[PDB]
Design an enzyme around this catalytic site. Structure first.
Site, PDB file in Angstrom:
ATOM      1  N   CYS H  15       0.842  -1.181   0.000  1.00 43.87           N
ATOM      2  CA  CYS H  15       0.000   0.000   0.000  1.00 43.87           C
ATOM      3  C   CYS H  15       0.877   1.230   0.000  1.00 43.87           C
ATOM      4  O   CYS H  15       0.477   2.270  -0.521  1.00 43.87           O
ATOM      5  CB  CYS H  15      -0.969   0.026   1.203  1.00 43.87           C
ATOM      6  N   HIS H 320      -1.434   0.562   7.320  1.00 44.06           N
ATOM      7  CA  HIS H 320      -2.277   0.329   6.164  1.00 44.06           C
ATOM      8  C   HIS H 320      -2.670   1.741   5.766  1.00 44.06           C
ATOM      9  O   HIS H 320      -3.469   2.384   6.452  1.00 44.06           O
ATOM     10  CB  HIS H 320      -3.499  -0.517   6.487  1.00 44.06           C
TER      11      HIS H 320
END
Ligand SMILES: Nc1ncnc2c1ncn2[C@@H]1O[C@H](COP(=O)(O)OP(=O)(O)OP(=O)(O)O)[C@@H](O)[C@H]1O
Ligand SMILES: Nc1ncnc2c1ncn2[C@@H]1O[C@H](COP(=O)(O)OP(=O)(O)OP(=O)(O)O)[C@@H](O)[C@H]1O
Ligand SMILES: Nc1ncnc2c1ncn2[C@@H]1O[C@H](COP(=O)(O)OP(=O)(O)OP(=O)(O)O)[C@@H](O)[C@H]1O
Ligand SMILES: [Mg+2]
Ligand SMILES: [Mg+2]
Ligand SMILES: [Mg+2]
Ligand SMILES: [Mg+2]
Lengths: 50, 328, 262, 87, 173, 76, 361, 372
Positions: H15, H320
């Site tokens: 990510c 994240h």
């Protein structure tokens, strides 16, 4: 002592609420069962809604 | 804060010295700030927003009503005075740095009933894109005196942390009214919140970008320490419509209504005495009920006359047709 | 059905510790305060749709570590017990028959915009809201309110005005503020205040009642009838016969549109 | 020795105070705790029956709940602040 | 409860209740729930004083700021045997108080007190000590470390002017 | 060569190094005096990262310069 | 290291040290000769915030000259032993009373009314610093100075300006906040506001609005003003002399001077009584010129002419002329405040529209 | 139904790349140049053999962006690009024990490395677009005996150094472009404290400011993350960090553009009761830009907010990254890119990302020049 000049009695305020529900409470299962039996020394101290 | 650990009060009330874990630094913890700690061993796990007492300071916060500024209440110069005190320093502080003046913040909305004071703060709520916080002054009173003192402080400091908001103090004729002393009364408990309104506004610093509007529906119930104009800058009386102002107001209502044009809106202002802006708002809806009896899609000239008479006889039956609640 | 419950119960209890939701945080978290005691910094399993819950809700937490499994919706209080109906009228319309020549301004502003929004689309603008009934007693006002409710099939709340007077102070406005928030939640409701001249003549003791208790509740009911809130559709029915103990901010036309004399 | 004394306190444990609310039997005493809820608790042979009377504070253990010794009375933290006014 | 017990553990313990007004007040109970704590505490005092506990070693001084603020059980002597009045000072009773505070100050000697203090009347005993303080504010003005009669006759006059602000009218029985 | 290193607390300290030395020496020397471990260190100059395999003359890094130190963080 | 509980010491009772033959306790033990049998070392009883008391043999590392029957200690949670001593607790609202680099407003924001300033300096600031001369004089310290007069006179602003200017610690306290329905702990907010102050002495407790704990009444019947006065009496307790009010001071602003308590009329509570007037002729002109200092002005103005058309306005009303001058200038479409627009801001805002229709006046 | 762009599906542990790319493509010159790439774009030649790896990376952005704009697509692959990046820098190519797969770190570093690559391919003239040039005076505290002027110090984004000096972004920017340098060198003295003030001497046309969130705790010897609330204005004005001369130039242009911006905001609402209409206004706006304007410069001192990278959860050591970008057609309409979950969020959702707590909070803010 200012609720008898203020509302005719503070217990007459609760009584008056009661009686107004009961004017149209004639059918809830269809018929009256729960009656409101009121009582007082004389009825000159009652509210004109009673 | 103990300088080099901190003393916390759990909400199970029990107090502990706690340190710093590995999500927390030297500078993340402040006085009266909440922190989350671990239940097997007490140590600051995650810093958290201050104060769990807010839950009824969050029932005075709501998001903004999106009513336009193209339909408003009162078609006078009175709303442009609002546009200099409330609206413009939120849009542009650049002009007030060039003047060099301390930007203008406060305003009183006071005068006759039915003049659309709440209609213009809803109208402004769409336009400025500034968060609105709306207050009932009568929800600030609690049976157990001292509870509403807490309440006010919490809202006002939280609002200095927010940026570019307007607090609309509604119905503060109760708390915000008169002050007097008794000898065996019970008014004094309410006055506690009155006093707390003086001391948060004035602060020990001035408002941190809080523009304040106070709506009083009587210009006769205000604390004599918000009556002084230093914190309530230019204060604009919303009064009853003029004979030209009523004609304008009725034209907004009838452009929005389905009608036949060729109806005079000036005539309608003449039949009326000087009276609320809300009467003209009910001429149309009663002219709409006469539409249905008449079997129409429009309202035409005639039935507005009937509706005008209905409301006028109404004001004859009542009062506050030229009253100020006594004494401009 | 079989595959759905397998993986539903994997996070859903056995005992599901009740919380009360103080506030959410916009990271898929919340801070609950339980009625049992200890607060918890809970996450959210988030198959109950993060933006569907809000403060005041009662929440289902998991008994291993407290995560919001879900959210209960639909509550009741001892304060909406008073409002809610404990009967359905058994006398329907025109048992108030007679004096029927001004029942046309209560069946064309209360019943009708619910029955036809069509006719109020032709004119457009705001529909009729509110009526006040007044006259001498014996003109049937109290049952009339309960009979136009029969026809519309909109949630009919009824609250007596001697229960908007309390023997404690400050908590009066708090009771009255509730009543209209409940009503707008039903998209159509009719609220009947029986005797709204009973909040301007009634008091208990003078140190938690008095002028002040009366005064505040009138002011509160202004914001509720309209103010800033912009809530759902509530039709209002007021029966009164003392119409000079009220604020001159509610008995003006432009709130309670037609006033009816009997 | 400054740290030896700390060891000896550390490997010991605290006591939890009660007072004799009512005598029940020879080896069983009813106490009402200073934290609250009443118990029935025992005695060592580290205390006598002729050395206990009611309203006399007693120790209990927090791991067996048995009296080992007689404890002087308690007196408010608050009332000690009043004896420190004399000016 | 533990304060009266402690007084019995401690010979000649003397208890000043300072500023009782609203912790030994009347029955009230039509206001807050706070008013039921008042009662609860008030009973405690009388049960210690009188019952199967009686105090003759151990003394009560009850200091109150307005006599008629209290419950009638505290107006019932037998716990409270004397109700002693301490007056607002007399004409020449002010002289008596002035002489004890003129030995607290450094001065160059003053014995001209009597005329001024007699007709400067309006003082309670703490205002004699504040007339000392105001003479020490006049003193700092003149650049002195001492009180002189030039400070003194201005001091009593000034404190009198500021006490016209509001008065004290409370019933004395 | 004297260089300046702006730390995470935004205070500038000095470091004594060479233009022929590798970034691994630079980061080792900051480890001695602050405790920070090289593999979490990132030395920036010109908005461009100076990797472990670089030196302090690849980007014309001389004295009176300030490198901006920021720290790593894992995940994905 | 963590965790460890926070407690107070109920009392210290002290058992003997282990050097006798007959027990090492002050109490008597069933069974004789014992020296380590069921007799333990020095003892302190402490009250845990888990809400119980525990009788512990206190740690020999912690000297018993550190323990007081009223002192706040660390206790090891796992097994209850005094770990250390810690400074005394304060409630969170009382910890934010302190300065944090408070801005000064000094006497450059004040024009007109010099006399007031002088009284303030003499009352508060100089008995702190010149506290030796005061003993020489032979008099007792002031417990505070009252400020009073109509709303808007400038009281609050002075208080801030002078406390920051001289560097005396300014505690920010508002009167209703001490009234809480936790009373006993809300009365302990009062107690701790003095507790902080005695460590942070010399200090100025500026209580803004003194008609909640400065009420006339302490004869109240059948109402909850009997809750209110119990936070008033605790303040008067800490202005009775058991010192801790001798360098710890009080400023008070009040807008109504008619309802002040008779136990605050007396000196020993508030001693110096400063009146704040309606400004004189000259003073009004100074006030205008202080607000006009910040902003642009034209050089055709005269503050004396302006002071003719203002009739004994106080300072809030004069702030509302100087800002309203610059309202008008923006409204015309300039940015230069006209010397004519002071004249129009006087009439535009008097804190009153017109003088209310005349028909026989 | 309605037109909405596509996103990247996270492989997992990727990510840090996916989140960053989105924000960059909002930038108008950025997306343009990757599309109009030729294999004949002049390089900053001094030799070097990694110039050729830089070329390959720019092709991967071009095709990712082509996938993204076109609807024949619901997922954009990062896989070819991941392979190129792992060749390029061999720190992403390691192996975690008890966790798994290919090493995961660092959206900041990643934006730095991406701009480095683009500036090699598109020259130093492209470097100026995000690059900020300062005027640095290094001067003793009291009287100067040793002075140096550095403009060769430079950056491609600001570093807002939190030390508990943030409640607003500007304060912490101001105390991390203000500093004291202590010396360990012999002059005729030694350990002289120098006041250093860096002022911006050249604005970028695209502004990036990163919040610094990390700390090395030295009192426990373990990494923690600073958590603090910092309100960021959507409309950012950098006037106080410029020297008087440069501020004077940009503030006068800004005030005229704010007159036309006001005039639009009024006209927009009326016509309601779009791209072409903006272009009619653009031709009006460009006339108030200064005649001395140069390459790699904002014509104003004001920027508007087009991206926020947020980092959520617990510690650093974990992460994240979801992101927020502003629509390229709107100005108060924002797209939330939570990998391939793309949604419309409002201004209120952006405001909430000020942070403090385990919640979303800011690490990187992307703006761009030209008020509106
Ligand atoms: N000037 C106006 N123009 C149009 N409608 C109006 C006007 N004034 C009042 N109204 C109508 O009356 C309704 C209620 O008025 P509102 O709640 O704003 O009271 P207010 O003017 O603040 O007075 P008060 O303080 O006496 O209650 C509005 O929703 C609006 O429809
Ligand atoms: N005009 C009427 N025609 C028929 N029935 C009536 C009439 N007026 C009252 N009633 C009857 O009297 C009973 C109670 O009347 P209700 O309470 O509805 O009236 P109200 O006008 O509010 O006042 P009150 O109860 O004092 O008469 C019901 O049985 C109702 O049907
Ligand atoms: N002498 C002066 N010179 C300049 N400005 C003044 C002067 N006096 C008052 N002001 C201005 O008037 C304002 C109002 O006075 P302030 O609010 O400080 O006092 P207050 O009487 O305690 O009022 P309140 O209790 O209502 O807050 C000051 O903040 C200041 O702006
Ligand atoms: Mg009102
Ligand atoms: Mg009736
Ligand atoms: Mg004040
Ligand atoms: Mg005393």
């Amino acid at each position: 002592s200012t609720r008898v000049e203020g509302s005719g009695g503070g217990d007459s305020e609760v009584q008056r609420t009661m009686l107004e529900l009961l004017n149209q409470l004639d059918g809830f299962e269809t018929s009256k069962n729960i009656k409101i039996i009121m009582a007082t020394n004389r009825l000159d101290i009652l509210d004109p809604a009673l | 804060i103990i300088k080099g650990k901190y003393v916390i009060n759990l909400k199970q009330i029990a107090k502990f010295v706690v340190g710093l874990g590995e999500r927390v630094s030297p500078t993340d913890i402040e006085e009266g700030m909440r922190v989350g700690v671990d239940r097997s061993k007490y140590n600051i796990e995650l810093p958290l927003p201050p104060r769990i007492d807010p839950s009824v300071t969050m029932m005075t916060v709501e998001e903004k009503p999106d009513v336009t500024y193209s339909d408003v209440g009162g078609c006078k110069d009175q709303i442009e005075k609002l546009r200099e005190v409330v609206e413009l320093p939120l849009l542009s502080p650049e002009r007030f740095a060039t003047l060099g003046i301390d930007p203008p913040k406060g305003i009183l909305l006071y005068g006759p009933p039915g003049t659309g004071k709440t209609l213009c703060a809803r109208a402004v709520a769409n336009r400025t894109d500034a968060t609105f916080i709306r207050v009932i002054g009568s929800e600030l009173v609690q049976k157990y005196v001292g509870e509403g003192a807490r309440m006010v402080r919490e809202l006002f400091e939280m609002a200095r942390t927010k940026k570019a908001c307007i607090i609309f103090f509604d119905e503060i004729d109760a708390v915000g009214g008169a002050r007097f002393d008794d000898g065996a009364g019970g008014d004094n408990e309410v006055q506690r919140t009155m006093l707390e309104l003086i001391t948060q506004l004035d602060g020990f610093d001035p408002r941190g970008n809080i523009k304040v509007m106070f709506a009083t529906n009587r210009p006769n119930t205000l604390d004599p320490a918000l009556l002084r104009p230093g914190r309530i800058d230019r204060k604009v009386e919303f009064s009853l419509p003029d004979l030209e102002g009523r004609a304008n107001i009725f034209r907004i209502h009838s452009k929005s209504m389905s009608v036949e044009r060729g109806i005079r809106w000036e005539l309608i202002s003449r039949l009326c005495p000087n009276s609320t802006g809300a009467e003209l708002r009910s001429v149309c809806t009663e002219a709409g009920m006469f539409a249905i009896r008449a079997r129409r899609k429009v309202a035409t000239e005639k039935d507005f006359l009937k509706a005008v008479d209905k409301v006028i006889s109404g004001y004859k039956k009542f009062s506050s047709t030229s009253r100020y609640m006594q004494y401009n | 059905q079989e595959e759905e419950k397998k993986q539903l119960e994997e996070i859903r209890g056995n005992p599901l510790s009740i919380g009360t939701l103080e506030e959410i945080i916009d990271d898929d978290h919340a801070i609950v305060t339980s009625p049992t005691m200890p607060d918890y910094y809970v996450s959210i399993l988030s198959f109950v749709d993060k933006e569907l819950l809000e403060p005041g809700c009662s929440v289902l937490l998991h008994h291993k570590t407290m995560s919001i499994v879900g959210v209960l919706q639909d509550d009741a209080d001892p304060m909406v017990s008073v409002m809610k109906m404990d009967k359905s009228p058994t006398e329907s319309y025109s048992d108030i028959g007679g004096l029927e020549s001004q029942i046309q301004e209560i069946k064309e502003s209360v019943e009708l915009p619910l029955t036809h929004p069509e006719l109020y689309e032709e004119m457009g603008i705001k529909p009729p809201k509110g009526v006040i009934l007044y006259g001498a007693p014996g003109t049937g006002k109290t049952l009339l309110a309960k009979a136009v409710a029969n026809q519309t099939s909109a949630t009919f709340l009824r609250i007596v005005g001697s229960e908007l007077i309390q023997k404690y102070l400050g908590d009066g406005p708090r009771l009255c503020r509730q009543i209209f928030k409940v009503a707008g939640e039903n998209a159509p409701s009719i609220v009947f205040i029986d005797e709204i001249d009973a909040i301007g003549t009634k008091r208990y003791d003078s140190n938690s009642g008095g002028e002040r208790e009366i005064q505040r509740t009138m002011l509160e009911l202004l914001n509720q009838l309209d103010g800033f809130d912009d809530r759902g559709d509530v039709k209002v029915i007021m029966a009164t016969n003392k119409i000079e103990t009220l604020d001159p901010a509610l008995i003006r036309p432009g709130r309670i549109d037609r006033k009816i004399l009997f | 020795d400054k740290t030896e004394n700390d060891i000896k306190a550390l490997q010991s444990i605290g006591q939890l105070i009660g007072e004799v609310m009512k005598e029940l039997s020879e080896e069983k005493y009813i106490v009402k705790a200073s934290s609250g809820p009443r118990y029935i608790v025992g005695v060592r042979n580290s205390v006598d029956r002729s050395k206990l009377k009611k309203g006399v504070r007693v120790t209990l253990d927090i791991t067996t709940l048995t009296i080992m010794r007689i404890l002087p009375r308690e007196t408010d933290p608050l009332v000690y602040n009043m004896t420190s006014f004399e000016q | 409860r533990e304060m009266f017990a402690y007084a019995k553990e401690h010979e000649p313990c003397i208890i000043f209740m300072d500023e009782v007004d609203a912790i030994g007040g009347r029955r009230f109970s039509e206001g807050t729930s706070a008013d039921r704590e008042i009662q609860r505490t008030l009973m405690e005092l009388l049960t210690q004083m009188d019952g199967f506990d009686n105090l003759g070693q151990t003394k009560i001084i009850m200091a109150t700021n307005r006599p008629d603020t209290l419950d009638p059980a505290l107006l019932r002597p037998g716990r409270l045997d004397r109700k002693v009045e301490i007056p607002l000072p007399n004409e020449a009773g002010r002289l008596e108080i002035f002489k004890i505070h003129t030995a607290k100050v450094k001065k160059t000697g003053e014995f001209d007190f009597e005329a001024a203090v007699k007709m400067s009347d309006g003082f309670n005993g703490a205002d004699i000590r504040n007339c000392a303080t105001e003479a020490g504010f006049f003193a700092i003005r003149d650049d002195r470390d001492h009180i002189n009669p030039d400070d003194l006759m201005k001091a009593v006059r000034k404190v009198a002017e500021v006490k016209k602000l509001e008065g004290t009218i409370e019933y004395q029985k | 060569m004297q260089i300046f290193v702006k730390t995470l607390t935004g205070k500038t300290i000095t470091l004594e190094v060479e233009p022929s030395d590798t970034i691994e020496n630079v980061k080792a020397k900051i480890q001695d005096k602050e405790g920070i471990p090289p593999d979490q260190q990132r030395l920036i100059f010109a908005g461009k990262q100076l990797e472990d395999g670089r030196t302090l003359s690849d980007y014309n890094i001389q004295k009176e310069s300030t490198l901006h130190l920021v720290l790593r963080l894992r995940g994905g | 290291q963590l965790p460890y509980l926070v407690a107070n010491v109920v009392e210290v009772m002290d058992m003997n040290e282990i050097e006798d033959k007959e027990n090492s306790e002050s109490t008597t033990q069933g069974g004789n000769v014992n020296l380590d049998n069921t007799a333990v070392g020095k003892a302190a009883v402490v009250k845990t915030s888990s809400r119980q008391t525990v009788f512990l043999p206190m740690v020999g590392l912690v000297d018993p000259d550190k323990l007081k029957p009223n002192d706040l200690v660390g206790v090891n949670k796992d097994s209850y032993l005094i770990l250390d001593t810690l400074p005394s607790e304060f409630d969170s609202r009382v910890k934010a009373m302190e300065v944090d680099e408070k801005p000064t407003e000094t006497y450059s924001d004040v024009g007109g009314l010099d006399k007031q300033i002088e009284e303030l300096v003499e009352a508060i600031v100089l008995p702190m610093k010149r506290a030796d001369k005061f003993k020489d004089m032979g008099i007792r310290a002031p417990k505070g100075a009252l400020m009073y007069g109509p709303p808007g006179t400038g009281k609050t602003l002075l208080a801030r300006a002078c406390a920051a200017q001289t560097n005396a610690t300014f505690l920010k306290l508002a009167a209703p906040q001490l009234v809480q329905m936790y009373i006993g702990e809300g009365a302990k907010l009062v107690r701790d506001a003095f507790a902080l102050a005695k460590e942070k002495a010399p200090t100025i407790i500026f209580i803004d609005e003194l008609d909640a704990i400065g009420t006339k009444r302490f004869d109240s019947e059948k109402s909850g003003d009997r809750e209110v006065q119990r936070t008033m009496l605790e303040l008067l307790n800490q202005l009775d002399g058991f010192s801790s009010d001798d360098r710890v001071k009080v400023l008070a602003a009040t807008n109504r001077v008619d309802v002040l308590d008779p136990a605050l009329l007396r000196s020993g509570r508030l001693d110096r009584k400063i009146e704040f007037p309606l400004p004189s002729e000259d003073s009004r002109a100074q006030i205008l010129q202080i607000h006009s200092r910040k902003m642009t002005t034209d050089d055709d103005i005269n503050w004396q002419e302006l002071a003719r058309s203002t009739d004994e306005f106080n300072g809030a009303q004069l702030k509302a002329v100087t800002v309203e001058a610059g309202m008008i200038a923006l409204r015309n479409g300039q940015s230069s405040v006209k010397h004519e627009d002071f004249v129009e801001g006087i009439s535009e805002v008097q804190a009153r529209k017109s003088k209310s229709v005349s028909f026989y006046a | 139904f309605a037109q909405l762009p596509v996103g990247f599906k996270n492989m997992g542990n990727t990510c840090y790349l996916n989140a960053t790319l989105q924000a960059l493509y909002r930038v108008n010159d950025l997306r343009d140049m990757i599309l109009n790439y030729n294999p004949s774009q002049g390089v900053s030649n001094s030799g070097a053999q990694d110039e050729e790896i830089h070329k390959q990376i720019v092709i991967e952005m071009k095709r990712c962006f082509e996938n993204l704009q076109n609807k024949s697509f619901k997922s954009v692959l990062p896989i070819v690009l991941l392979n190129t990046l792992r060749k390029c820098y061999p720190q992403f190519a390691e192996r975690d024990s008890q966790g798994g797969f290919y090493k995961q770190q660092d959206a900041e570093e990643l934006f730095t490395q991406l701009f480095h690559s683009m500036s090699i391919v598109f020259g130093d003239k492209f470097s100026e677009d995000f690059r900020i040039q300062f005027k640095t005076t290094i001067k003793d505290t009291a009287n100067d005996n040793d002075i140096t002027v550095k403009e060769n110090e430079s950056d491609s984004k600001l570093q807002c150094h939190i030390s508990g000096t943030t409640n607003f972004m500007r304060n912490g920017l101001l105390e991390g472009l203000n500093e004291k340098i202590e010396k360990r060198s012999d002059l005729t003295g030694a350990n002289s404290i120098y006041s250093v003030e860096k002022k911006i001497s050249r604005l970028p046309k695209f502004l990036t400011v990163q919040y610094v969130r990390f700390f090395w705790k030295r009192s426990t010897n373990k990494k923690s993350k600073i958590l603090r609330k910092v309100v960021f204005p959507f409309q950012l004005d950098v006037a106080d960090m410029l020297t008087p001369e440069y501020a004077a130039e940009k503030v006068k242009v800004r005030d005229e553009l704010r007159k036309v911006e006001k005039e639009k905001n009024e006209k927009e609402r009326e016509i309601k009761r779009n791209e072409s209409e903006k272009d009619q206004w653009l031709e009006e706006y460009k006339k108030h830009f200064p005649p001395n304007l140069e390459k790699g410069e904002n014509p104003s001192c004001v920027y508007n907010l087009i991206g926020v990278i947020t980092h959520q959860g617990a510690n650093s050591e974990s992460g994240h990254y979801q992101a927020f970008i502003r629509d390229e057609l709107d100005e108060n309409k924002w797209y939330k890119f939570n990998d391939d979950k793309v949604s419309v969020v409002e201004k209120e959702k952006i405001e909430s990302l000020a942070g403090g707590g385990e919640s979303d909070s800011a690490l990187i803010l992307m703006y761009k020049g030209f008020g509106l």
